[PDB]
Amino acid sequence: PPDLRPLVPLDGGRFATSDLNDLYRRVINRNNRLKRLLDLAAPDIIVRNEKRMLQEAVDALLDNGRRGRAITGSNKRPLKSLADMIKGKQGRFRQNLLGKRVDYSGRSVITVGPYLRLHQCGLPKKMALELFKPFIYGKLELRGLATTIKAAKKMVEREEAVVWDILDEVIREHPVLLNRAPTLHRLGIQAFEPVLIEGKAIQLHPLVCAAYNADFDGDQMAVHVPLTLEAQLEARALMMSTNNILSPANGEPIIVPSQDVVLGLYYMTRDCVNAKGEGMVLTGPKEAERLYRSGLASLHARVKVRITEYEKDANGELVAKTSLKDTTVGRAILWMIVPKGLPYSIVNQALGKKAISKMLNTCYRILGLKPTVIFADQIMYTGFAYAARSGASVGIDDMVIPEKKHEIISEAEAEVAEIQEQFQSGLVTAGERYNKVIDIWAAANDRVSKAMMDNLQTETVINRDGQEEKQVSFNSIYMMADSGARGSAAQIRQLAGMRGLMAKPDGSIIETPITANFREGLNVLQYFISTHGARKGLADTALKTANSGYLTRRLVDVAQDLVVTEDDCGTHEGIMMTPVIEGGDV
Amino acid sequence: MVYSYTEKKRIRKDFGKRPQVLDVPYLLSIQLDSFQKFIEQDPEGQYGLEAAFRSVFPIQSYSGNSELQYVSYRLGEPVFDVQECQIRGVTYSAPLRVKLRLVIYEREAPEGTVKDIKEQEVYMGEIPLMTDNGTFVINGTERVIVSQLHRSPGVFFDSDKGKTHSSGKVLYNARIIPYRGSWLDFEFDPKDNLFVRIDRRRKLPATIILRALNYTTEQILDLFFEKVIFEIRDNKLQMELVPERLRGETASFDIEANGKVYVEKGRRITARHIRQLEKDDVKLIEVPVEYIAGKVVAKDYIDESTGELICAANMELSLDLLAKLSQSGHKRIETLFTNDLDHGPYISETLRVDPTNDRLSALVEIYRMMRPGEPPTREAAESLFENLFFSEDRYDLSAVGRMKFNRSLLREEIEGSGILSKDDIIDVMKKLIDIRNGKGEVDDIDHLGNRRIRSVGEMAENQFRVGLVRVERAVKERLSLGDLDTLMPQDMINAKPISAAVKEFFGSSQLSQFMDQNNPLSEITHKRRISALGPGGLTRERAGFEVRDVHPTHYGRVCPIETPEGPNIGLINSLSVYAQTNEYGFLETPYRKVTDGVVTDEIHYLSAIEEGNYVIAQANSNLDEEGHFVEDLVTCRSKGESSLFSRDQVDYMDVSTQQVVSVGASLIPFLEHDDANRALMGANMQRQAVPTLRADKPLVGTGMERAVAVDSGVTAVAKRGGVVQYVDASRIVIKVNEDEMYPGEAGIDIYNLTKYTRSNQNTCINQMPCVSLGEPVERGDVLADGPSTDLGELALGQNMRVAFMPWNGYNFEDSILVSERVVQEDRFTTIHIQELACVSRDTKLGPEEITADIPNVGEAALSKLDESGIVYIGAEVTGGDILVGKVTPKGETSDVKDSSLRVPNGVSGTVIDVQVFTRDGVEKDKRALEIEEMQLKQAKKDLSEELQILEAGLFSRIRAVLVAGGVEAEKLDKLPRDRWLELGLTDEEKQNQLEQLAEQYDELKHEFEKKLEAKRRKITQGDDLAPGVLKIVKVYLAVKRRIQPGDKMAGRHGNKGVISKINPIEDMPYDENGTPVDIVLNPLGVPSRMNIGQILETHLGMAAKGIGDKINAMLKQQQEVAKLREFIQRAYDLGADVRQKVDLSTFSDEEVMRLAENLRKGMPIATPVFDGAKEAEIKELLKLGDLPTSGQIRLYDGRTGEQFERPVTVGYMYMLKLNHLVDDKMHARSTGSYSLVTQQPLGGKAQFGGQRFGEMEVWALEAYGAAYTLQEMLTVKSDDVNGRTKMYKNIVDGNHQMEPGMPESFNVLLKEIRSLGINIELEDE
Amino acid sequence: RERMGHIELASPTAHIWFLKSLPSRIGLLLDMPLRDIERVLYFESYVVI
DNA sequence: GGAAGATCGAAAAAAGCACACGCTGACCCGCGTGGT
DNA sequence: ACCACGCGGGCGGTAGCGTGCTTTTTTCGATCTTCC
RNA sequence: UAUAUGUCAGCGUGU
Ligand SMILES: [Mg+2]
């Protein structure tokens, strides 16, 4: 039909060229020439050539490049035949049927909203005004501010005061679907309650970022507006952020503090052996908060406070127990946001990432879902606030280099020089000499890392009653490493110890390791050596995406039609599961 | 040392310790020098257009007793200047006129001489000319042709790593790759058979190509094998023995000679027995007949008595065969020395498998392999074989190809014929066989010594040669059949193919691309780029892993960290700072020669191949002022590996510490403290920073900013020294010194700065003067600052007071907290210029007129339009406003439809420029006349300034002449100067001198009038456009984009983020002095992403700002210049044995005051890429000011006023604003336009469109229940038109219910399938 | 968007989808090689009905 | 002991190569040939 | 005698579409070997 | 909601 192969108007009298129209014109011309040749009783050669050329034209129309060279148009390129526009990634099946562009949708960059709740997101006023235009029109017509659709359009274009109130009314409980561009798994699109904000960037809850695999480095997100009541109810009940708390892949939780909440809770829940207002007795957590805010006590002061903890009996009733507990001011303050059903043992320790995750798991197991959500929101708020209050910072003096690094390096160099002398003497051949050199350098790196960790973990010494005492260090780098916020043993080792051995692009280990810290200066040779591994990793990451996407598409296709359609087969068959062991490990 | 005038204004403090021995070369030379090898006249050719002309010409006429020859070529002067071509949109190009000579010889005489010669000069198209900045001007746009990293022509020996055979056996192959011709391949079969392939076709036995070379079987065995002679004498079966031939083989019989049993049967021959054999020098060893049966005869043996051959060449011997040959009367036989490992019988097996037996059979087989359809013919096969590899026109191994071919085969000569030869193929086969045996090793494909760089000149020459052969075919066709009596050389050729080919190459190519204009660094990086893609190169999808790796040969030639991140990683690289190309195109790097343990200052440029032989010491090698390394063991690199070496074994040393990084990577301070991935991210992100309206120098730099700014053409560099005669915001006039004045010259240089010109990335290009009136200048001194430049130094971002601390989760992952003071000061505000074009064409019904009268528009809309129908300059137009009024004739069936250009929805700005291009023959409107008038006014102003200075000089001369005789100087000033000319003196030589001066003045006036007339003619010349279009009107809109949440900012150390909140000033943390911080950054990014360089830069910037604050405080107290001199000298003298020495004693008091005024905002510090400041130096600089050495101060919370419990790292960091603006990234649509075929919402933000709900989102919805949501996304919101209407009506009516309906995409698919012979339908049963 | 049309070919023409989509339906049903099909179809040789 | 079925290996062909977004360039034309 | 439809559109060359991807399917030519 | 007229290539950005 002509409308499926339209002639798109252009500037002036020009018209857009369509490959199908050219193919049809060529076929028609060939057919007409063949008809006029047959009517004129042309010789056999001419009619045979005309028939062959008509067959070739029909073949090109049906499938251009299937046989021979594809017919090219005015653009020096093969034309798009009927088969070319139905198959492939750009065909109708994969471009306009399985996926398609939708209305009531927008796209914008994402910033961080710390004040938002787990079920809320920040939507700019302009985006919400554009997306919810028909709802605003309907509400304006119902309330009588406008009499026709044109009047409502003019009023929303002029952005009158009543328009903002209408927009606030229509988005009270209307969920919006936020989705990131790579939708790897189910949690890539989630429903949130919109909150009107200024600015031009969508505000996203931090706790869901790990679910979205999204960072605030320039990432963008798309928003969709459900229309019918059924879609809104599915968004509220199935795709809401609060409903998605466990990963469908393995059942692990997906809402965990990542960077600043963990650091804040770790700093707040810590003890100093000699701090301000140590050893005093407090009536409760409220007194501890009052003392900390008034400046009369420190957040790490070891005190005794009266804690009332509620526990669930067999019948499920909450029974209170009040007792004096030896704790810190920060732990007592944090106890305020803990719900009643939880015990005090969760907060009476240095709260790292694992500790916070375990406390959230216990809260979910004991109480339920809504108390868990409220607890998570309160945890995020408290962590952010006390991380801001702490004022932790990283400086060039925080990466302490051990004084024994030079001695260890010199000993390793002496050992490898002795090995080289032995090789020159001829007692040891190249392969075993290389192996011994690698082993010596690995041992030296391990010794340097151990010495640096020993120096860093307990560097701080505190004078208690005139006596020196060793305590866990308050170094910012060490605090970040220990709390689990960011960084690991390997990265801290690279920062404060030697970088260790490096590998060639083929995989062979280089004899001379990088004995320079990141705090110190890496010379040209060491940087060039590290660039091999850096480029190898970056190239692997760049090339992995296409293979991963193809595999995911194939798996989705092969398992697209499998759904649960029954309750019980009654089958007595099954598979026998045993622990997996291969000669040393379970 | 001494400092230039522009450098003395603000001297950057340099912390570099290692003295520099070689200055940084010109960055764009690689782009320029190559073009200098393409258009320059070459007396011996081998380069440029001369090489192509000599390769094509002379041209025969199929033995037509006539030809045409090429004499010389000349490039004419371009019609328009570079600025003129940019303004008018034409291509900056120059004509090429070639001298041709058609010679016709006498007929009927094969040896007859010339009967006629016709010489002429013919124009053969216009070729583009590269500007002074290494860029081309094509269609008014600046394009850059990046260099291509490809595989050098020659022979390469490789082998699969035991993969295809699936048995661990390596199949060696050798590939001959010509510049032009057919690729040749030799491969080893798993059964140890040599096969030959041409153009990757079906394999054939290798001996076929030898037979086709007129080689007999005996000759082949002689060439590829060693002969062992067996001679029967006195019934003992003796043979000539070479001891080495019996190494590693078990003795089947007893080896006894001269009565001594050397070896007995059953025991393998040992090396000691071989040594004893050569001690006794035995040549005849008794051999039993059983040993013969395992030998292959070498040459044919034919019985003389019977006349028939007993045995041919190359087959296994047998007992009957040896008996027959023994009884035939032959006493001598020759066999092939075949060993199990040293000398395999590959050639013999290949001959056995070879079906051909003669040269003609081999030629027939080759022809039937190449062209199976055509039956073989003797002449056809001969011609095909000759044209395959032995034809100059068809096959051409380049000079570099021949050099590599000879080098790989260990040939002393490096020159030879382009075509192949029998000796070359024989040597290649022998080397491949030796490699298979074990001698030698395969080549490295990714080795930088086997990879060539093709620049603009080489590709341009290749395209010109292609066009030359294209026109030569037609020239031959026309000349052979036409009449030779009246054949002018001009009409025989056609410039159309040459022009089309050159335009196709320069305009539409994979390597000729739009030049990035985000910043000068972007242009520098783009010009110095090497891409492995393009024609005759790798592809993005099929690149692989090995190509993208960092080869050890990349040291000093290719930057390891500067490369795009994404699909094209490792395929696009940046040239190193000191890297340069050889004569053959291979990359080479400088080194300093070490002789007798001292490091000399002589510089040798070593290539990748030749640098492996020597031992190159590391750049970071400590010297003792005597050129001797202090350490006994120096870490050097000998053969692609780093190891310790004795101090006397070194041969070369690195010229500089920046030799390993590129220009972009060398601009990052403290790069050695940053991770390689983070350094790569920072280097990539640096060239994406949009310029700001105010340029701010980097407080912490590397000292390479000056070179980058000067080398790029953004800034205005004085051509000659002098004084600033006239300064202005738009132009500068410099009165040059008399030393540099040319004879008969006015003596003024005029620089016209570009003011608010749209760039290729819709950014603002603005030049601001940096000199004052009367200020002396010198050659090479910057007169105006281009975009992102500050006093001749590159300035990408701004210095922000940053504090590293978490702040209420507003910098949670990567977010950035920005104070309101940054917004108020307009520091990060950018200017974006967008061009909108409206063209009036000539339709079939009628032309399109651009008039101010438009139907169905109100008077308010036409208020902004002028009488000519074009928007006024300076008018502020919002979205939907009308800019240019145009009417298009309606159908035949008012009669005019509105096709006026309108501002796109959501786009605002101020009209700053309107450009009208009118085709010749079309009457110009008022706006075009006004533009031409203003251009003529500017040209007349310049010419009038020149005429005024020249006339003043001439009038001074005439006054001096007249005063000598007249002596009326007291009254001469009373009358005006013109009346001096009409005054006459008494009759002597003075009157003649006055007449000569008057006629010179008249001639000067006439010449200036002629120049003005020529400029007016050039200005008023009609513009050339595409056929069918009459007029073009372009309107430029300028928008000031301010910073806001969602905008993407970054640093130089790979740290990036988006603004999360614009907090009020009072909420920012403040120090004891109450100064708030500007930016708050999350410390959590530092540990995981290992970039301590940003922390060190923060500390150094804090120290620099402390020094600047001290200088400002001393300036505000009106202190004497002595205190300022002492303090600045103390600041500059800080450090440990730094190479930079600044003596303020030589500086004048005014110069010291100017330097202090420049430094009052902070002292710039130069930190080299690998020779930067140490921690101790930073602490000393911090102690110089009143700042703590720890780098952390005490901060108070703005909101609560409570001191933070721990010190926080505060300082000054250079932050950049990337070209990712949130307001340019928004989009929102409820309902809009729909597509035609699919009836789906459109795509993109320029046209109102919706987001794409792709396959992954559909799968995610299917993972949930989401049935109704998916149905409404697939039908109601996208395709179902009735569903769309009903849903909209229901929502307006307050009912949230939908009707699914039938999507139109499925109907379109059904019709598409039905268009074929396949019937598809829906069944209602 | 729905109404279609037809073109009356002067001579019969083979369908490529049933021609060069392996296995060749014409060749498989006629039990004779695909190259023979291509040769007889594109007017280069004769075949006996 | 020779025709026919089974096997091996090289060659030719076909199909595949993640998602989202942004920008620019082209959407004539040149021979040729009968109609006039 | 000049000109407007028209049509197919490939460069280069005694044609054939190749030079740095991987996997699967089909086809044919050479070799073997089974057996009546 | 139906508005004024969108299709192909090449290049680039973020996962
Ligand atoms: Mg990101």
Residue numbers in the entry:
A (entry chain J): 246 to 831
B (entry chain I): 1 to 893, 911 to 1342
C (entry chain J): 99 to 147
Quote the authors verbatim:
In free, autoinhibited RfaH, an α-helical KOW domain sequesters the RNAP-binding site. Upon recruitment to RNAP paused at an ops site, KOW is released and refolds into a β-barrel, which binds the ribosome.
Thus, the extended ss regions in the opsPEC form independently of the precise sequences in the bubble and the hybrid, suggesting that this extension principally depends on the NT-DNA hairpin.
